[PDB]
Amino acid sequence: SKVCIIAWVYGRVQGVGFRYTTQYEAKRLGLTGYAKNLDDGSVEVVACGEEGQVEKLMQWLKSGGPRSARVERVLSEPHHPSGELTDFRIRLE
């Protein structure tokens, strides 16, 4: 079913078309959400849709996004988006 993630992408990610290309790939994957630049030199991505289509976006982001960019680190939440579909559970760290 429909999962959501939020990812923050650090590196050379602003002013190299990162937002515009995420839009393009997010559409092709039939995903909903948005992308936004932040004051700290990073880009936030919010994406919802089917869990396999979302994971294809997490892979594209992590594999570096567009070719004009140099992604150094990606922090997504949650790390296992499948935990969002389970009737309300408790979990250990």
What CATH code is carried by the domain that includes residue 56?
Answer: 3.30.70.100
Residue 22: closest CA among 51, 52, 44: 44
| Number of domains observed in the structure of the chain | 1
Q: Count the alpha carbons within 13 Å of 44 in the hemisphere toward its beta carbon.
A: 10
Instruction: For Cα atoms 53, 24, 79, give the angle at the middle one, nearest 5 degrees.
Output: 40
User: Which domain does 32 fall in, by range?
Assistant: 2-79
**Structural method:** X-ray
Q: How far apart, in whole angstroms, are the C-alpha atoms of residue 46 and residue 93?
A: 24
Does residue 91 have an active-site annotation?
A: no
Cβ 26 vs Cβ 16: under 8 Å: no
Choose, from 12, 37, 67, 91, the residue flagged as catalytic: 37
Residue whose structure tokens are 């909903």: 32
* Domain annotation covers residue 85: no
Q: How far apart, in whole angstroms, are the C-alpha atoms of residue 77 and residue 64?
A: 18
Choose, from 19, 67, 89, 91, the residue flagged as catalytic: 19
Resolution of the coordinates in A?
2.6
Q: How far is CA 3 from the centre of its chain?
A: 12
Q: Is the peptide bond before 78 cis (omega within 30 degrees of 0)?
A: yes
Q: How far is CA 83 from the centre of its chain?
A: 17
Does residue 73 have an active-site annotation?
A: no
Residue whose structure tokens are 């150094």: 72
